[PDB]
C-alpha cells in the first residue's frame, strides 16, 4: 500500500532518491532514503541545563 | 498535525481538557481570540432560559512545567457546529488531533560526523521558521516580610544602583507591564533594613573624601534569573491587611 | 575559453522563474551553478518588517477585542509580507482598518515609495462590527536572517513599550535548482548549457538577482585582480 | 592503530587517528550509505522452510 | 559584556587545560583533560574518538 | 598548544617528576622569579617550562645549581 | 562513521570505471576520482612509495 | 548593500612544487564557494602541456616484451606520463629517445628539439641492461585543457593538468564581533610546469573572465 501511495504521488517505489551536496554540488552515490518524519522537541532544553 | 498518525490523536486531544468542545450544537454567533458565542439550535435548548453557549478561552497561562497553555479558535464566523466538534484547539492540538511535534523532511545519511553517535543535523531553515520555537512562562515573586530591623520595603529607591536599572520601574518600584527585560534587570525593587554598618578605616576615608554616605538598608530585589530573557505579561500584587495600598496596587 | 552570456529569461509565475546561460565549456555547469546558488541563497538585498506597534497592544502575548487572530499570529502573518522599496531604506507604513471581514494586505495606505507583490495576503481576520485596528509597520532593507533577539544590542533607546520587534528575514529568493545539458554552439561539438530554475518571493527581479550574484562572487577575487 | 603506536610511537599515532577520523567522516558522508525498506531482502525460501 | 573582555578571554584560556568528566566514573578515563576551544551556544563540543 | 609531553618525558625518568620540575620553573617564570630560556612565542608559563625541559637546558639539577648559587649571591651583599 | 567510510573506500568491485588502468601515484588516484573519471572501488594497480 | 572584502592573510610554501594559501575573513559559505570553484577549475580544466601517445620501435604492444630491459612496457608507458614538459609557443611536437648505452635512461637522453623544455632532467624513463639492447621509441606530445584519459582517446594517458593535487578546508574565522565567519585554506601540488601561486591566480582569472559578461561598476 505504501508503494501504491508513492506511485500515485509521482514518487519512486523504493522510497529512495538522489541527493546533491550543497557545498560541492556533486551527487551522493548510493541513493539516500528521504521522507517525512514526526519529530518531538523534548523538555530537556540546554538553556535549563547549562 | 502529524503527517503519519494512528487515528488515536482525536481520542486524546478531545478527551484531554486542553481542547474546547461544544456542549450543545448550533451556529457560531461570535468568534474571538478570547471567547466564542454559539447560538444553540431550537431543538437542543432548554425551555425556560436562554439562549446561547458562551465559552471563555484560556490565554497564555503558566503551566506546571513552566510551559505555555493556550487555546486558539479553529472556527470562523457563522459556521454550523454540532455537539462533539472542537471549538478551539488547545496546546499541541490541530483541529482536534493531538500534535506533539512537527513534520520534518528527514534524509538518512552521514554528514561530516555531525551526526556521529546520535547527534542530529538540523537545517537552518527549521530554526528560521520558528516551527520548533517554544514559549515558556516563569513565575517569580518578591516577598516583603517583617524583620528584626523592621518591615522591608518595595520602594524603588535602592542604593548601589544606576539610573539605567531603575528606569524600568514605577513609582512603587515594580516592573512595567509589557516591558521586556533580561537577566540582571530588577523586576520588583525591595530593600531589607540592615544596620550596625562598620567600615575599615580605608572606607571611612572614602566616606570623608567624596561625601558618599553609607545607607542603612540592604538590597533584596526580584531580578531576572541569569540566562533567561523574556517579556512581562502579568504582574500581581498581594497586600496584607492593615498595610496601606501603594500606587501600583 | 568562450565567455558565457544569458539567453533565456521567462518568468512563469509571480514567484517562479527560470534563467539560462548556454555558452559554457565542458563541465562548467556544476562549477558555476553550485556557486551561483550559494550566492543567491545567502546574499540578496530583500526587504522585511522589523518593528511593529499595534495601538491597543503592549506585548505579543495577548488578545484584542474583535479580532480572532492572536497578536502573535498577527506578527507571524507580518513576517510573510512581501514588499519592495527603491528610494529609501527606512520606511514606515500605516495600516488602519475597521469593519468585519478578513483584513487583506491591500488595506495599507500607499506611501510615495512602496509596492506590494501580493495584496491577496492576510494580516488578520476581524469578526466585530465596530472593531478598528491602527498599526504602524516599520520595514527596511538588509541581508539574510536577523532574529529580533540578536537585534537588541545597539538598542537605539526604543522608548515606548508598545513597540514590538519582529524577526527580520531579508531573503528575496526562496529556492534554486540547476540542470546542465549540451546545447550545441554554432561551432562546437559539445558545450553544456546551464538552466537555473528558481522560486522567488516576487520582490527582486530574476535578472538583477543573477547580476548581483556575479557581483558578489567576483568581488571575492579582489585579492588578485585589477581590471579586465 | 595498535601497530602504528607500537612501531612509530605516540606522536605519529595521535595525528594518524585524527586523520583517520577526518577522512572517514567526509568519505562516509559523500558515500550516501543510506538504508531503505528494500535493503532488507527476505529469502524466498523462508516461506517453505517455515512451513 | 564589553567587547574588550572577549579578547582578554582568548588570552586567559590559551593553553589552559580543563578537566571533562562524565557523570558516571567507572575508571580513571572517566575524567580527561582537553584544550578549551571557545564556541558560541550553550552546548559543549566533545571529540568523537574519546 | 603542546599536545604531548613525550619528548619532555624522555629527558626525565618519571612522568611525575616532570610535573614537579616544570612547576618549579613555571613558578620562577610566572612569578617575578626569572626570564625564559626559549623564545616565548606567546605560550603560557607552563608550556615554556615544558619546552625548556625538552631542549635539555632545564631540569632538577640545573635549577638546584642556579638556586644554590643564588644562595651565595645574597651572602655577598653584606660586604 | 569512520570505519564505515574506510570500509567503503577500501572496498573493491569488478568492472569499476577505469579498472585495470595504472596511475603515477596516489595523487593521481585522488585526481581521477574527484574528476568523475575513475571510481573508488576499481581494481586499479598504481605505484606507491612505502 | 556592501560586502566583506577579504585580503590575503598569509602564504606558506613547503617547497617549489607545493604550496598552501589562506584567505580570511570570508562570509558564511563563501569559503566553500571559492574552494569548490577553484578546485573544479584546477582539477578538470587547465591550460598546460603533457604527453599524449607514444609508440615503440622494438615492439608495437602495451603488454609485449623487450630484449635487454629489466622493466616491462607498461612501466615505461607510465613513466612517460610522469615527464613534465613546459612547451613554448609551438602547438605540438613528437620526439624520439636515442640511447643504447649501459645504465638507466634519464630524461636528458632525448632529441633536443627546437622549442621544448623539461623541469625534471633526471627523470628516469627506463632501465637499460648490459651490452647493447638497441631501443629508440617515438613519443608524441600535445596541448589541451584538463585531463584526458587514454582509454577515452601506444595508448598513453595525457594529463594536461599542471597541478598534481588540490584540496581546500573551511574553518572558523575570528573577527571583531562576527559570531561565525568562514576561513578558506587551499593546498595544491604541481607537476613542475608552473608554481602553485601563478596557477591559483590563473584559475581565478579563468573564473573572472567567465563572469566578465556581468555585474556592475
From Swiss-Prot, chain B:
The domain of life is Bacteria
Record PTM:
Acetylated on several lysine residues in the presence of glucose.
Biotech use, in short, is:
Co-administration of salinamide and rifampicin or salinamide and myxopyronin suppresses the emergence of resistance to both antibiotics.
Q: What does this protein do?
A: DNA-dependent RNA polymerase (RNAP) catalyzes the transcription of DNA into RNA using the four ribonucleoside triphosphates as substrates. Resistance to the antibiotics salinamide A, salinamide B, rifampicin, streptolydigin, CBR703, myxopyronin, and lipiarmycin can result from mutations in this protein.
> What does the annotation say about its assembly with partners?
The RNAP catalytic core consists of 2 alpha, 1 beta, 1 beta' and 1 omega subunit. When a sigma factor is associated with the core the holoenzyme is formed, which can initiate transcription. The rRNA transcription and antitermination complex (rrnTAC) consists of RNAP, NusA, NusB, NusE (rpsJ), NusG, SubB, ribosomal protein S4, DNA and precursor rRNA; S4 is more flexible than other subunits. In pull-down experiments interacts with CedA. (Microbial infection) Interacts (via flap domain) with Escherichia phage lambda antitermination protein Q; this interaction renders bacterial RNAP resistant to transcription pausing and allows it to read through termination signals.
User: What family is reported?
Assistant: Belongs to the RNA polymerase beta chain family.
Q: Please specify the portion of the entire protein covered by the chain, as first and last position out of its full length.
A: 697 to 945 of 1342
Curated annotation (Swiss-Prot), chain C:
**GO BP annotations listed:** bacterial-type flagellum assembly; bacterial-type flagellum-dependent cell motility; cell motility; cellular response to cell envelope stress; DNA-templated transcription initiation; intracellular iron ion homeostasis; nitrate assimilation; regulation of DNA-templated transcription elongation
EC no. given is 2.7.7.6
**Region feature Alpha N-terminal domain (alpha-NTD), mapped onto this chain:** 1-227
Subunit note = Homodimer. The RNAP catalytic core consists of 2 alpha, 1 beta, 1 beta' and 1 omega subunit. When a sigma factor is associated with the core the holoenzyme is formed, which can initiate transcription. Both the N- and C-terminus interact with different regions of transcriptional regulator CRP. The rRNA transcription and antitermination complex (rrnTAC) consists of RNAP, NusA, NusB, NusE (rpsJ), NusG, SubB, ribosomal protein S4, DNA and precursor rRNA; S4 is more flexible than other subunits.
An annotated Gene Ontology molecular function: DNA binding
Q: Which residues does the annotated region (Required for interaction with Crp at class II promoters) include?
A: 155-158
Q: What is this protein called?
A: DNA-directed RNA polymerase subunit alpha
Curated annotation (Swiss-Prot), chain D:
In its record, the post-translational modification comment is: Acetylated on several lysine residues in the presence of glucose.
Query: Practical use of this protein?
Result: Co-administration of salinamide and rifampicin or salinamide and myxopyronin suppresses the emergence of resistance to both antibiotics.
* Superkingdom of origin organism: Bacteria
Outline the subunit composition.
The RNAP catalytic core consists of 2 alpha, 1 beta, 1 beta' and 1 omega subunit. When a sigma factor is associated with the core the holoenzyme is formed, which can initiate transcription. The rRNA transcription and antitermination complex (rrnTAC) consists of RNAP, NusA, NusB, NusE (rpsJ), NusG, SubB, ribosomal protein S4, DNA and precursor rRNA; S4 is more flexible than other subunits.
Q: What does this protein do?
A: DNA-dependent RNA polymerase (RNAP) catalyzes the transcription of DNA into RNA using the four ribonucleoside triphosphates as substrates.
Q: Which family does it belong to?
A: Belongs to the RNA polymerase beta' chain family.
Question: What name does the UniProt record give this protein?
Answer: DNA-directed RNA polymerase subunit beta'
Native source organism of the sequence: Escherichia coli (strain K12)
What range of the full-length protein does this chain span? Answer: 605 to 655 of 1407
Swiss-Prot record, chain H:
Question: Coiled coil among the record's keywords?
Answer: no
Which reaction is this enzyme known to catalyze? RNA(n) + a ribonucleoside 5'-triphosphate = RNA(n+1) + diphosphate
Q: Impact of altering residue 40 to C? A: In rpoA112; temperature-sensitive, blocks RNA polymerase assembly
Which key words tag this protein in UniProt?
Acetylation, ADP-ribosylation, DNA-directed RNA polymerase, Nucleotidyltransferase, Transcription, Transferase
Q: What is the effect of changing residue 174 to C?
A: In rpoA101; temperature-sensitive
In short, the EC number is: 2.7.7.6
Listed under GO cellular component are: cytoplasm; cytosol; cytosolic DNA-directed RNA polymerase complex; membrane; transcription elongation factor complex
Outline the segment boundaries, as ranges, of region: Alpha N-terminal domain (alpha-NTD).
1-217
Q: Which domain of life is it from?
A: Bacteria
Q: How is it modified after translation?
A: (Microbial infection) ADP-ribosylated on both alpha subunits by the phage T4 protein ModA. ADP-ribosylated on only one of the alpha subunits by the phage T4 protein Alt.
Q: Which GO terms describe its molecular function?
A: DNA binding; DNA-directed RNA polymerase activity; protein dimerization activity
Assembly information from the UniProt record: Homodimer. The RNAP catalytic core consists of 2 alpha, 1 beta, 1 beta' and 1 omega subunit. When a sigma factor is associated with the core the holoenzyme is formed, which can initiate transcription. Both the N- and C-terminus interact with different regions of transcriptional regulator CRP. The rRNA transcription and antitermination complex (rrnTAC) consists of RNAP, NusA, NusB, NusE (rpsJ), NusG, SubB, ribosomal protein S4, DNA and precursor rRNA; S4 is more flexible than other subunits.
Stated family: Belongs to the RNA polymerase alpha chain family.
Q: What is this protein called?
A: DNA-directed RNA polymerase subunit alpha
